[PDB]
């Protein structure tokens, strides 16, 4: 149960691997403290997730499997796909620029929803909270 809105609490590494993806520094800084929240809704394979933040207030729209392109908010443009692994939600992504692959992660730990970003051997995790 993904469903509903996830509030960010806590970050792990995220200025490390926001550095290796080559963003810059005041957008780091700021990436930091981004006050970022989730409105996760499911609507049968179709996904819509209503991403806020002090960047920007975006839905984004996604059906399982299926491969879509996504913006990073600092521009970094991203395609691919989310598929359901069980209990999880793993995206696979791959920059426009560059192509390398980007790894994310979603999961629900009780009251958590743990994402984990994995880049050029780079692993960072935001914990979000539910509201």
């Known amino acids: 149960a993904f469903d509903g809105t996830w509030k960010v609490d806590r970050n792990e590494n995220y200025e490390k691997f926001m550095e290796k993806m080559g963003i810059n520094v005041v957008k780091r800084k700021l990436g930091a403290h981004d006050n970022l929240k989730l409105t996760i809704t499911q609507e049968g394979n179709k996904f819509t997730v209503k991403e806020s933040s002090n960047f920007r207030n975006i839905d984004v729209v996604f ?9 990073l908010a600092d521009g970094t443009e991203l395609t691919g796909t989310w598929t359901m692994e069980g209990n999880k939600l ?3 992504f791959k920059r426009v620029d560059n192509g390398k692959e980007l790894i994310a992660v979603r999961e629900i730990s009780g009251n958590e929803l743990i994402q984990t970003y994995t880049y050029e051997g780079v692993e960072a995790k935001r914990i979000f909270k539910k509201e």
């Open 90 to 92: 793993v995206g696979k």
């Open 63 to 71: 059906e399982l499997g299926v491969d879509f392109a996504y913006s």
